[PDB]
């Protein structure tokens, strides 16, 4: 309960403390319909039956309570619990945006798929559906003990003596199938990921005869699944078993302790005829908490997972903005060491961009050119260096005039699942449709338009899956074009574009109205078409830099980098 | 349901043996509560020690064994039904293996996990609960109201006060819940695809829009608006119900209804006992189902929802059953209902030919090697492999024919020799490192920190252009006779471009290929060049023939030069 309270709003205290008080005394009203049988009952067979409408009107007053008490601790559970969904939900939509690349491994991407996964109705009930009940059913036997005192002492104390055992058992059964519940979803998250794996490269893993369960990877992690899941159903029966012995030896307690008492005179044979009730009902939670024991764990992972995003490191950032808005800011870098892991990616890369110049980045894969870009951009920051933009460091920007200073063209164009026109429209959303029109128009998507049936309504698959390579870039092309930012970076110009749509989106990237410091990345010479300033990253480091002409006149490097 | 009834065909034999035990462990539960009510009943009467300790012994052993046997029931039925579960999962695994990949790109990666995850999961109350619990219900009410009615009609009848508000609120919670539960299974793989697209996606939404101004964020309020409309008067009516049937209720009113009659001269107070023992029973049994009627929808649903996947087209090797050759014939293919994307396309490989198509962006190239590939099934024509359709050829014998080079880099998790040895898995190490070294990536692989070892998940994950040589290299060292490669070396640079394609013609000098490349410099040696543009060839020769003839090709290679 320590990891859930900590994730309820500041706003919802109050009702947490509403409801911790209302759940104490909703089991205490519970516990008090229980033993009032035994005046209630004493009196009705006794000579004197007319003495049981006292006991009677008093039961009536505490189940009418315990009905007002319960509808309430439900009104608030299910509001805690939702508070806490919508509260958790929107932290973990806020924060991953903010979360550095570094931090999306395989694994960890993959609990922040589930824990975004986990918004459904077992998580959002989960204060009623876990906590009041399984609340109930331990504080019940403890609140009857208690007010079996007044009956009398001994047997009162002697119940109690009944929940010593039942937590013992309690956390005898959730430490025993600790491990087993923690290996089944281990291999339950790795069968996911799996699946969304196979359903999302079925392409190649078809021509490579690797989809069959026989001999894919799916099939493999199905089967270690199944294990997993079927050592956690025979590792679940210990704590059934340890219930059930602490249920018959509270039994045991109760009956001689009662047995005594009435031997001895001090209770009454009705009295012990309610105890029987009594007693039933006191046994009932013990029943009712190994239920939960499954839930509860599972409850504990989800919790965990959600938590585990919520803690992730957020990128630095400042609070500075940009002092020019509109016009083109000068890309400086000075000293820019950048690393993946261990590996050196960036060794002193300094260069200087004119502002409203049009920059060429230029060189062999894995070079590191499109990490340049990525560091422009903020997306990555530097391991020591500092990336100015306009003089002011981008590490001191405020994250919302960080994003929106610099438009990208990635390598890779990924899309969304959606209309193309929604997928051109996210560059700036409020842009009017004449704008809209021209992004479109530069990026050479007219042509989709008036191919495809539906035309800037065609729905894409997932990702960019449902156009083909050149078309999804060209949308990608479309969407960056689209936003006013005054820097344009671009991972990769028309990889995927024949030499006719080529030749149009290198033009129509140069020819855009509006004043931008551009900086663009190509394999083909005819993408650096009239560059202002070209760089040669070979190693991580700019071996020259220059015109296109007086690159080739000097014969550096980059003249024969074409030459093949 | 057929289809829900048609997927748990096999269950039928374990779900009437756990009614029929159920039926029993009921009764047996209920057995030791009649013991009690004897013993009440002679203590009041005042009988022997021997007589009251042997019903209390007998009662406590009866309800231990009771619960033994249903833990015993519960353990059998949960292990059956993940046996079950396992074998679907197999079954859907094997199906979506031969599905058209159609099915794939229309669907979503989010969409297959529901189905083969969640909704398999979502039987699990369907087929380990629902019978039981129904047959508990339908028994222990019955047979407890039946024994009340002869104990007292008086205290028995008050006893479907309860009852029958019980009956009604479950009633109009699942008339109430029926369209929700209904609606879920889309929520849930909307709600899926867009946490799947959100962190894939990460850059996007990182520039484009940030945090605020995503559609991620947005579904999800909607999302969390309509659990909060479903899952509202689903908990009232919820906890309703277990105030009406909860044990302090029932004995309430069996006290109400009961102290009038003994106070007044019109019942004994001995005959209170059996209301008071058993007339309390029963409420948590009827609950059990109250519980259990949304299971049991939401099972139905997810047991039709595979068994229509199930019925789905499947690709199917027709019964109709040159080396080194592909041979379409007036192919025509349509990813969608009047949308055709190639026409009348007829093109025929050779051993130790070098067939390049170009033309175009999206004029349906990759679809054309798609096809090939038997991804999808041409809707008119045939593609003949060594005279073989491929309609004929099993897909071990179809694949083993024709090695493919995607567009898009697809990596899977697993290790850098995992993923150039995906096609043959038992490859040596040295194998793959040829194959490594002739893809211009063993030189990379060797700097990482692990080797060949290093994981290529999410994360971890290479350049480009390092990627799509690691799919080169996996491509040859599959080692076809036929090879297909789409936009291969698109993100690679010219030294690199120039180094694979000269390991790739050393590679095939007497094998079939079929380069596919926007960059026409490099087509500019090939065999024979097949411009395809709008989906249908309209020019087919040489490279100086192409050009000679001042069309398509020629507009094309003007538009490069520049
Ligand atoms: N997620 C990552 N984890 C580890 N290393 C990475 C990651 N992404 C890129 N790298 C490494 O970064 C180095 C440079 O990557 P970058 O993306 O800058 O390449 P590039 O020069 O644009 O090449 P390409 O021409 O292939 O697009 C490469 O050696 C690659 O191994
Ligand atoms: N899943 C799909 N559903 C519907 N149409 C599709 C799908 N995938 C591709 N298409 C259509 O196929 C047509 C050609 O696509 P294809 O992948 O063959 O292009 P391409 O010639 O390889 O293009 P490029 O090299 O420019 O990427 C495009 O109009 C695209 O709209």
Known sequence: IRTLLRLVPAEKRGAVAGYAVLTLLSVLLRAVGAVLLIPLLAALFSDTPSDAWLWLGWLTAVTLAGWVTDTNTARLGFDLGFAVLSRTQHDMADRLPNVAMSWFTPDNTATARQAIAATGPELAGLVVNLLTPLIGAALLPAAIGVALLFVSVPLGLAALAGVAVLFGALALSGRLSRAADKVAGETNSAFTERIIEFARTQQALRAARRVEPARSQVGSALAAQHGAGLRLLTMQIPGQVLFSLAGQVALIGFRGMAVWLTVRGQLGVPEAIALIVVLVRYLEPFAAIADLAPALETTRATLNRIQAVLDAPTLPAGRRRLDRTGAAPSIEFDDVRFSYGDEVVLDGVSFTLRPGNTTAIVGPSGSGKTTILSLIAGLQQPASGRVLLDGVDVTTLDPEARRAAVSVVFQHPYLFDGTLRDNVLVGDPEADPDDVTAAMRLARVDELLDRLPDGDATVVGEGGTALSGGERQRVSIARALLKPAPVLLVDQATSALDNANEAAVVDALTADPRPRTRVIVAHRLASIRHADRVLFVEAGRVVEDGAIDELLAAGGRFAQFWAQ | ?562
């Not at chain 2, 043996?17 to 002679?42: D, M, W, Y």
């Not at chain 2, 068994?307 to 349509?334: C, H, I, K, N, Y």
């Open chain 2, 1 to 562: 349901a057929e289809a829900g009834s048609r997927l748990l065909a096999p269950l039928k034999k374990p779900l009437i043996v756990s009614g029929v035990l159920q039926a029993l462990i009921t009764l047996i539960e209920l057995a030791p509560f009649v013991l009690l009510v004897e013993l009440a009943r002679l203590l009041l009467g005042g009988a022997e020690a021997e007589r009251l300790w042997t019903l209390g012994l007998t009662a406590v052993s009866l309800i231990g064994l009771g619960a033994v046997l249903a833990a015993a029931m519960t353990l059998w039925l949960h292990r059956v039904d993940a046996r079950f579960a396992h074998e679907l999962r197999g079954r859907l695994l094997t199906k979506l293996s031969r599905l058209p990949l159609g099915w794939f790109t229309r669907r979503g990666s989010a969409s297959t996990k529901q189905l083969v995850q969640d909704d398999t999961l979502a039987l699990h109350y369907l087929i380990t609960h629902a019978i039981p619990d129904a047959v508990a219900a339908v028994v222990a009410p019955v047979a407890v109201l039946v024994y009340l009615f002869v104990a007292d009609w008086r205290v028995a009848l008050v006893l479907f006060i309860p009852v029958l508000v019980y009956l009604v609120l479950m009633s109009v919670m699942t008339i109430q819940s029926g369209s929700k539960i209904a609606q879920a299974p889309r929520w849930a793989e909307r709600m899926g695809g867009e946490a799947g697209a959100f962190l894939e996606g990460q850059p996007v939404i990182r520039i484009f829009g940030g945090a605020a101004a995503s559609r991620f964020r947005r579904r999800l309020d909607d999302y969390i608006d309509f659990l909060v409309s479903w899952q509202r008067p689903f908990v009232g009516k919820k906890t309703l119900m277990d105030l009406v049937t909860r044990p302090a209720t029932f004995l309430w009113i069996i006290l109400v209804a009961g102290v009038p009659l003994v106070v007044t001269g019109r019942m004994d107070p001995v005959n209170l006992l059996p209301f008071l023992l058993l007339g309390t029973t029963f409420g948590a049994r009827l609950l059990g189902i109250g519980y259990g009627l949304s299971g049991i929808q939401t099972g139905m649903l997810a047991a039709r929802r595979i068994q229509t996947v199930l019925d789905e087209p499947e690709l199917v090797v027709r019964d109709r059953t040159r080396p080194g050759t592909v041979e379409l014939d007036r192919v025509s293919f349509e990813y969608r209902p009047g949308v055709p994307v190639i026409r009348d396309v007829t093109l025929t490989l050779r051993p130790g030919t070098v067939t390049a198509l170009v033309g175009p962006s999206g004029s349906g190239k990759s679809t054309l090697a798609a096809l090939v590939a038997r991804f999808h099934d041409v809707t008119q024509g045939a593609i003949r492999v060594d005279g073989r359709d491929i309609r004929t050829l099993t897909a071990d014998e179809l694949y083993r024919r024709v090695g493919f080079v995607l567009q898009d880099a697809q990596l899977v998790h697993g290790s850098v020799a995992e993923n150039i040895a995906l096609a043959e898995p038992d490859a040596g190490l040295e194998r793959i490192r040829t194959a490594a070294r002739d893809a211009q990536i063993h030189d990379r692989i060797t700097r990482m920190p692990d080797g060949y070892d290093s994981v290529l998940g999410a994360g971890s994950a290479l350049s480009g252009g390092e990627r799509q040589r690691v799919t080169i290299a996996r491509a040859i060292l599959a080692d076809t006779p036929v090879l297909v490669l789409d936009q291969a070396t698109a993100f690679a640079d010219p030294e690199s471009e120039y180094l694979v394609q000269q390991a790739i013609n050393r590679l095939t000098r007497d094998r079939t290929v079929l380069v596919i490349a926007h960059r026409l410099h490099t087509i500019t040696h090939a065999d024979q060049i097949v411009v395809l543009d709008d989906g249908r060839i309209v020019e087919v020769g040489t490279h100086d023939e192409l050009l000679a003839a001042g069309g398509r090709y020629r507009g094309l290679w003007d538009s490069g030069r520049y």
